Structures are given as C-alpha cells and as structure tokens.
Design a protein around this ligand. Structure first.
Ligand SMILES: Nc1ncnc2c1ncn2[C@@H]1O[C@H](COP(=O)(O)OP(=O)(O)OP(=O)(O)O)[C@@H](O)[C@H]1O
Ligand SMILES: Nc1ncnc2c1ncn2[C@@H]1O[C@H](COP(=O)(O)OP(=O)(O)O)[C@@H](O)[C@H]1O
Ligand SMILES: [Mg+2]
Ligand SMILES: [Mg+2]
Ligand SMILES: [Zn+2]
Lengths: 310, 390, 403
C-alpha cells in the first residue's frame, strides 16, 4: 500500500485501516485484507488488535510512529497494563507485533473472557459534530469503546445502533456522517458519567505504561488501605461499611448496568474477593469503583503512584 | 521509476496560497528573466572536437535535434498559464483544514453507486481549470511541454502527512477511441512513476466501464495529482458508438466536479469534435514588413552549431531565404534539414553549406513530406484543406 | 542465439561517455571502409573445370547465395544504421551514480533562494524512424542481413544482468492485422533468446493496446537496439480495421517503445504513409531512402557501377571454353534483358550457364541469353517491358515495381 493515512488524534487503528480502505475505493473486504496485510485469514478487531508491525511498517517513513506508539496510544492497552502485572504485560506487548490474535487475548483478563461485550457499533451525537467541524471526517474513538461502560466520558449517553463487528469477521467499517444521529431523548446516571470522566484520563497518560504493581503489591496495598479506613477487624472485613459506602456512591441501577450487582449474602463476590488475597488480576472497573467509593481525593494516576510506591 | 524529493516548505506571497502543504512546497514561481533562461539549451561545440575524424564529427553532429531548444514568445504564455492552473488547483483541495478528506469521502459513493454526480458533501467545491492546445504537426507541442513541466519534481513526499504528491502525469489516448484503454493508460503511467501495482488490481477484477471511470478519478485524488495531460486527443474521432461524446463529457465532469485540472493536445483535426484554447502557427518570415525577430534569432542561434571545417560565420540573406522557402516555417523541418545538409556535406567532403546543397538535400531526402510543404507554399485554402494540417 | 561476453571499448565521441551498451558494440569503422567488409565471392571457383557434369552444375547454383558486391548506395544506409543503433542508447544509461542526493540538494538550494533555477529529470523524446522504399528485386533484405551481421545479436554484460539484444527483425502479416504484428515480436524474441514469451504475453484477453504496452517493458529490460519490420505494404486494405486505425497505431507505437524503428516496404506502401503530415513526419524521421535500378550510363558517360558489377560476376564461370574478356554487345544485351534489377541479373546468368552446360556448347552468347530469357523468365516480361517504356502509370498497373 503506497499511501497509508496517519491516525488522527485519539483514534482506534481499526478506524485507520477502514479509512485507508475508503480513500482508495477498495469495496471488496478480501481485496482490502490482501492489500493492507497480505493474508486473507485476519480478524478485524476493535480494542486489542493484532498484526501491528505491518501497520507500523506502512507508516515507517513517518518518523514519529513506531510499534509501541500504536500499541499504547491507538489501542485499548492502557486499560489492562497497570492491573495484569509485569511479565504478562511484556509478553502481551511482544505478541501484539506478531500474527497471533488468540494468545494476545489469552494473556489479558477480559480479553480471555471470550465474549465480545456489546459488539455493536457505538457513537456519540455531539462528538461527531465536533469531529466534522475540526477534522472533516468521522472516526471511531477510544473514548466511546470503553470495555464495559456504554457511555461517552464527557457527554451523556452513547446512541447505539444495529450491526456489529462479528456480523462480517473480515470487513472494516468506517462511519459515514449520513448516519449522523437520530433525535430521541436519552438520560444518563450522574455517578456513571462521573466514573467515565474518572477513568478517561487513564487513556491519555504516559505514566500508565511503567506503573504495573504486582499481585502481592495489590493485596498488601488494599490491606493497608482498609486498615487505615478503620473498618477492618483483625484479619477480617466488616462487609457492611464497604457495601454501604459503595451503595451511597453508586445506585443499584448502575451496578445492574455495569454487571457488578452486589451479593453481600454470598461469600464469593467481586467486592469480597478484593479484600482477600488476590488470585488473578481484576478488571479496571472494579478497582475504579473501589477507589471512587473509598477515597475520591486522588486521581487514577495518583492511585497508581501510591500502589507502585508500596 | 521517479525520484522522490523530500519536501521543504517556503513562504508564498499570496493570501490564498496560505497554508497548503501542496502549493507551498512547489518550486517558486519564476519571473520573466527565468521564463526565457530556464528553457534554453544548446550543443557544447568544443573547439577541440572540430579537428577529429569524419566518423566522430558525424556522430557528434546528429545530437542537434535532441539537445537544441530556443524558447519563443508563445512558450512564455504557455508556462504562465500552466503555472497558474497547476497552483490554483489545490486551494480547493486543502489537506490541512479537512478539505481533501471531503473530496475523498464523496468519491467513495461514486465507486459504490456508479454515478459520478452523487455528492455527499455540498460544501466541497472545485477550483481547477482547463486548457486546449492545437497546432500544426512539428510545431513543438510535446518537446515544449517536456521542458516547461520539467522544472517540477513530479513525485514529492510530505512526511507531516503520509501523502506522496504526484505533481503532474502524462498519458496519451488509445489508437482508436477505446473506452477501457484510456482508463488503463492512466494506471500504466501512474504505476511506473510510483513503482506500484495499480493496473493489476484496478481492471483485472472484471469491472464495468462506470466503475473504471470512478476508480481512476478516486486514485487520482488519493495522490494529490496536480495536472493530467492527455496527448493526441484527435484519436477520439475514430471512436466506438458513443465514445466520441461520453469521454468528452467525462473530461468536463473531471475538471468541474472532481477538481483535477486537465490539459488536452491535438492537431487542428481535433477542433471538429468540439475549454480555453491556444492556437500555434508556424513562424512567419514577415510580421510588419520586416523579418521576424524570433525567426532571425532562431536561425542565427542554430547557425552557431557547425562541425564543418570550412564553416561560414556570416549567414547570407539568400541562404536564410531558401532555408525558409524549403522549410515553410515548421521547426522540425528546419532542424532536420539543417542536420541532413550537414551530414551530406561531411559525406561529400565539400564542407560549406550552399543553397544548391540545401535544395538537393530537400529534393532527395524529404520525399514523403513534399505535398504538405507544397500546399503550405501555395497557400490556396483549397489545396490546404487536404493534408498539411493547417 | 549465442551469448557473447562483453568486452568494453572506448570511443572518441563525448556524448557516449561511459555507456555499457554503446561501448560494448564494435568500434566505429569509417563508412568508406564499411563497404569493404560486405564484399564476398564464391569460394574456390578454380581448378574445378575437369571435375564432372553434375557436380560442376550443382556448384554453380550457389552463386546467388554467396555473391555480394557493395554499390554506392550501401555507404549511406550503413552509416544511417550505425548512427541509429548507438544514438538510441544515449538516453538509456543504466550506470547512474548518485542522483537522489544531487536532485535533493538542487531542490533545497532553489527553495532557499540560493539557486535561481534548476532542472529536474526529463523524459526522452520520440524514437528515430527510417523508411526504406525500393522496387522488389533490389536487395532490401540481403543488404540488411549483410549489414546487421557485423553486429553480434545477443551480448551478455557481467557487471549488469541484461542480455543486450542489439537488433531484431520481424515481418508484417498478410491479413493486415495489428495483433499479428505485435505477436511476431514475441515470436522473434523467442528465437533469439531462449525463454518463452508468447505463452505469457500472447494471450487473447489482452487487447492491441495492452500488447503494445507489454512490448515496451521487454524492449528496455533487454536493451534492444533496432526493430525492423519487413514488407509493410501488407497493411493496406485489411478487414480488421479502417485506414485510420493503423495510421494512428504506428504513431502510438513509435511514441511508446522508444527503440528506433526501421520500415522496409515497396513503392506501393508509399501511399500509406503519404496521407497526412503526422505519419509522413514520423516515417521520414531520419531521412527516407529510395532505391532505383542501376542505370547503364549516367549523364553522357557509361556508369562505373554496372561495369564493376558485371566484370566481377563474369569471373565465376565454370565453362571449359570460357571467354577471356567480356564484349560490349554481350554487356548491352545483358542490360537490355536485365533492366538493372538484381534478381534478373544473377539468375539470368546462372540459368544461362546451366543452359550452355546442358546443350554442350560451352560458351555464353547473346542468342543464348535471349533464348533463356524468352523461355524461362516469362513472368517477369510485363514489368520489364514497362520499365523499357518507362511510363510511370503503365508500371503502376503492377503493384511492386517503382512508379
Ligand atoms: N521551439 C523549438 N525549438 C527547437 N526545436 C524544436 C522546437 N519545437 C520543436 N522542436 C523540435 O521538433 C522535434 C519534433 O517536434 P515535437 O516532438 O515537439 O512535435 P509534436 O508537436 O509532438 O508533433 P505531432 O503533431 O506529431 O504530435 C523535437 O524533437 C524538437 O527537436
Ligand atoms: N548488391 C548486390 N550484389 C549482388 N547480388 C545482389 C545484390 N543485391 C541483391 N542481390 C541479389 O538479389 C537477390 C534477391 O534479393 P532479395 O533479398 O530477394 O531482395 P528483395 O527482398 O528486395 O527482392 C539475392 O539472391 C541477391 O543475390
Ligand atoms: Mg507529440
Ligand atoms: Mg525481401
Ligand atoms: Zn461525546
């Protein structure tokens, strides 16, 4: 391919490849896969793509784009890197370069959850207008495609529509403004929008690359934090004050929507397992809820600094 | 195939040419001093290479037709017009403030729906213009377009984007008025100036005529093509059923809607099929009752390239008159006749050019072009109507 | 078809400089001495008189295929071919040095205002074309095969990887077709090299234009020097396309391939190229050569070409009672019954010798020449009689002799 578009600011590489297909009139998806990649057995993935390294080679003449830059800034890697650990993070970075989609997903937690959560395409009414006003195009953006939240960080709600990634597994689709929006009222919960605005700065932060505390670091950090809050009995959890605080911070409808509904009667729970010794890396969203319920005076980067220090 | 010149941006002095990477990276607009000194060329004529053998002195004298060029009055106007229509065709195609991304987005629908008037944006206009060049055969339509378009770098590479701007492209029409062989010469000339494979993937997939008319004009916008030149547009006279008008409708939809400038070249036999037009004519000896200054300069600059040992520096009025009489104004005939006379003089051994020698060379070695020159000599419109292309 | 390993030479012309293609070719012989390598004669026509009657008769019929006498018109043609082969290589210089850095330095200097003007890469102009037109029987193919034989066909270069095919000779099709003269190119590049091309590039899906743009890549992949198309008269009045679908085909073909093109044809084919200024300009690109039969006398004195062509042919006789010196009446009879055409000179001599050998009267006489001409050479009678009359339109009834 003799002319590969540079990704716009804060874009998914899937949209870059789709726009590369648009700019040359390659309607046939097989022809697009042949030209861009060279093999017809690739999967168009949104969030944690593979085969980067032949994408970063098309942009090789542009000095400022390398493999790490696409891995960190134009794929949803910063939402898994701080939590998984060190060796898993390094292995995943090494495997994004090569042609293995399966191994990359296996190394990461919910990437190995083998379910494409809300695989349908999302978009935000107001963001598309701004992008049309400034860039002149409309592209998929990392803010919309949060792992579990169907919500834009700044505006209210993400207006869904039909079609999905898995309907055609070998085709890249690029948004056209002719489907700009449909005017129908939608209101969003305040605390969920607050969570989106709290987790958004983790995407655009250089310090998220090298701050990945280990498992024992996570469990010791949470243990000392719970001791400092004073709700901790001797080697035990109160299991009541924490639930009360998280219920005050986030309502029941929210916990239903993000699929973390509390079961205080059940001994095994997403909140209960954090206090005990950590066995596997928990998702970013559970940690976000814990942080926002316990102490709101520190940002995500400050929390990562405190966790990495000791 | 073509050398990729890395771009460096200058400071243009025009308000409209404000921040375009495409037209702020072209070579600076030259002036009247550089409109008549960046085209001139001549043979070296070293005095050390005049005393050599006959074979060396006869092989080094045949390079005159290829290496000699003298800019006339018309070339200044042609250069200025091409400069204007190649610099003004990018202002409506700004890649910075989202204007080229609005011309490429529309062109995907035309590939999909097959109709070349399905706009998706209405705020993306076109700012290209058109030119038409018509002149007698041998006037210099190609060799004075390969030295006026040769001051531009063709393939440029801008690294702020990833775009590889192709400044100008040249193709020529099919031997008949073919339909799928004008949209294939474009690909065959674009992928030998980039080292790519566009013909093997646009056309080999069994496309229709409409899809190959849309894909051509989409890939001509993926690379910011500045000027498209089509040589010998008279080949569309012998077109297929409807080809003589469908392509001339496309050539007015490309400059008006898609926005790529286009320039057309053809012999006066191509005026029947019809665009600002420029008409070229052979040099006339008399302009206002006195010999033409351009003709005098052309002759007196050609006369200073002579490998004959017994050469005459002074050019006789009789010799000039018989040269014009046997040439009838066409520059190709002028240069070719001079070279042939010089070769025959070297062959005989008499190394001074004479009017009789000129006439003998003409009569013996210009047999096919005889009736056209005689028709132009007679100047009767009835005789001119058949052949001589005037 | 045999690869000759390149051996580089230096020439005195400055425009050629260091060009592998020009410098690997044989050196620049002067045109005067270029007509001393064409000459040949029948080897060992001596001491064979007392051999037999049948061997001495099979050893005469090789006179037409082993005798060549250069004339005055074989200097100009040889010089034009020598200029045309090497002048078409100066543009194609493969051993380019550092061009990227020089061009970029020029671009930066002109963009910063230091250098006022600069010239970037240029495109080579149209290829030189020559048209040779002569009446049939004058030697338009023997001359080419004895002039191009001094140039090795396929030369192999060691530092490069190109098998420089110095020349190529193809012939036109009898249909007048235009896809059968773009395919003789591959079928004649297969008999010079070893690889096959008609299997790959000779399909039926490819049109005439595509077959004209794939005979341009393999025309500079091997640095081909000349393209000779023989018997161009066959293209008039063909059922494939009109008269303006080929007058444009030549223009396009000349404008694409870039290798010099030589066209050999008959005075009937002049009317094809004298139709418009474009085709006559391109066809007479490097002069138009017109060939005529030898005249017995020029101005008021006997010609010195006919005498030199006759008195040397007379020294290949194998009759026992050979005449020592040639007589004026015999020469005049030979000219009157020959009219200057080459094939009605050597053949009229060989046939007369065979007749004199068969009859047993071992002597060549005027009556024997007249008898053999009236008996065996019947089909050549009308056009020779028209030449005797000399009336142009009477000759124009026949379609291959000069009019
Ligand atoms: N102004 C000029 N000064 C010097 N030489 C010239 C000039 N114009 C043309 N020539 C000579 O004329 C030769 C042939 O002319 P050219 O190739 O430009 O013709 P053309 O316009 O392409 O003709 P056609 O009608 O066949 O398309 C060139 O090789 C060049 O040497
Ligand atoms: N200069 C010459 N000297 C001797 N014989 C010649 C000469 N030119 C032609 N011939 C004879 O003419 C015969 C026919 O020539 P040919 O190659 O058929 O020319 P064409 O194809 O133009 O008729 C040849 O056999 C050759 O012997
Ligand atoms: Mg031309
Ligand atoms: Mg022949
Ligand atoms: Zn938004």
């Amino acid at each position: 391919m003799r002319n590969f578009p540079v990704p716009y600011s804060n874009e998914l590489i899937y949209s870059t490849i789709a726009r590369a297909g648009v700019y040359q009139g390659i309607v046939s998806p097989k022809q697009l896969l042949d030209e861009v990649y060279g093999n017809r057995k690739v999967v168009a993935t949104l969030g944690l793509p593979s085969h980067l390294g032949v994408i970063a080679r098309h942009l090789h003449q542009t000095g400022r784009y390398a493999v790490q830059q696409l891995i960190y800034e134009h794929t949803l890697f910063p939402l898994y890197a701080p939590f998984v650990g060190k060796e898993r993070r390094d292995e995943a970075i090494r495997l994004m370069e090569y042609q293995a989609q399966g191994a990359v997903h296996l190394m990461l937690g919910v990437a190995a959850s083998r379910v494409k959560s809300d695989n349908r395409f999302r978009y935000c009414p107001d963001c598309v207008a701004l992008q049309l006003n400034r860039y002149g195009e409309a592209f998929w953006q990392r803010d919309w495609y949060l792992p579990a939240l169907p919500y834009c960080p700044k505006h209210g709600a993400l207006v869904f529509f039909d079609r999905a990634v898995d309907d055609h597994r070998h085709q890249f689709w690029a948004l056209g403004h002719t489907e700009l929006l449909s005017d129908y009222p939608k209101d969003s919960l305040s605390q969920l929008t607050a969570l989106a605005a709290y987790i958004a700065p983790l995407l655009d932060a250089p310090r998220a690359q090298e701050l990945s505390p280990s498992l024992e670091q996570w469990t010791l950090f949470y243990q000392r934090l719970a001791q400092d809050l004073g709700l901790t009995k001797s080697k035990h959890i109160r299991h009541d004050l924490v639930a009360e605080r998280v219920r005050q911070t986030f309502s029941d409808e929210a916990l239903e929507k993000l699929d973390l509904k509390l079961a205080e009667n059940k001994d095994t729970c997403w909140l209960k397992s954090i206090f005990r010794k950590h066995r596997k890396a928990f998702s970013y969203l559970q940690h976000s809820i814990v942080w926002q319920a316990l102490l709101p005076k520190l940002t995500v980067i400050e929390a990562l600094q405190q966790a990495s220090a000791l | 195939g073509a050398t990729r010149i890395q771009a460096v941006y200058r400071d243009t002095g025009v308000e409209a040419y404000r921040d375009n990477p495409f037209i702020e990276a072209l070579p600076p607009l030259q002036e009247s001093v550089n409109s008549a000194a960046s085209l001139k060329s001549s043979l070296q004529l070293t005095s050390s290479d005049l005393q050599k053998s006959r074979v060396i002195r006869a092989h080094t004298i045949c390079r005159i037709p290829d290496d000699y060029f003298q800019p006339l009055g018309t070339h200044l106007l042609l250069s200025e017009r091409i400069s204007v229509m190649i610099r003004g065709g990018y202002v409506g195609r700004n890649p910075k403030t989202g204007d080229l991304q609005k011309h490429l987005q529309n062109g995907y629908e035309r590939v999909q729906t097959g109709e070349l008037e399905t706009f998706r944006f209405e705020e993306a206009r076109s700012t290209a213009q058109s030119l038409l060049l018509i002149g007698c055969s041998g006037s210099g339509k190609t060799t004075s377009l390969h030295r006026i378009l040769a001051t531009y770098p063709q393939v440029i590479y801008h690294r702020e984007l990833n775009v590889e701007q192709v400044v100008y492209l040249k193709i020529d029409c099919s031997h008949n008025g073919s339909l799928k062989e004008i949209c294939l010469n474009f690909f065959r000339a674009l992928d030998r100036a980039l080292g790519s494979n566009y013909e093997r993937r646009y056309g080999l997939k069994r496309h229709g005529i409409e899809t190959m008319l849309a894909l051509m004009s989409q890939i001509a916008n993926a690379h910011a093509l500045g000027l498209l030149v089509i040589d010998e547009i008279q080949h569309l006279s012998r077109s297929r059923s409807g080809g003589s008008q469908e392509m001339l409708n496309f050539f007015v939809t490309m400059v008006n809607i898609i926005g790529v400038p286009v320039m057309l070249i053809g012999t006066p036999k191509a005026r029947e099929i019809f665009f600002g037009a420029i008409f070229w004519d052979p040099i006339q000896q008399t302009q206002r009752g006195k010999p033409n200054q351009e003709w005098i300069a052309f002759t007196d600059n050609l006369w200073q390239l002579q490998l004959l040992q017994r050469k005459d520096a002074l050019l006789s009025d009789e010799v000039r008159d018989v040269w014009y009489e046997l040439s009838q104004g066409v520059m190709d005939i002028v240069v070719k006749l001079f070279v042939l006379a010089q070769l025959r003089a070297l062959a005989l051994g008499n190394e001074r050019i004479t009017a009789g020698l000129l006439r003998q060379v003409y009569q013996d070695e210009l047999k096919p072009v005889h009736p056209m020159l005689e028709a132009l000599r007679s100047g009767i419109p009835e005789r001119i109507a058949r052949y001589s292309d005037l």
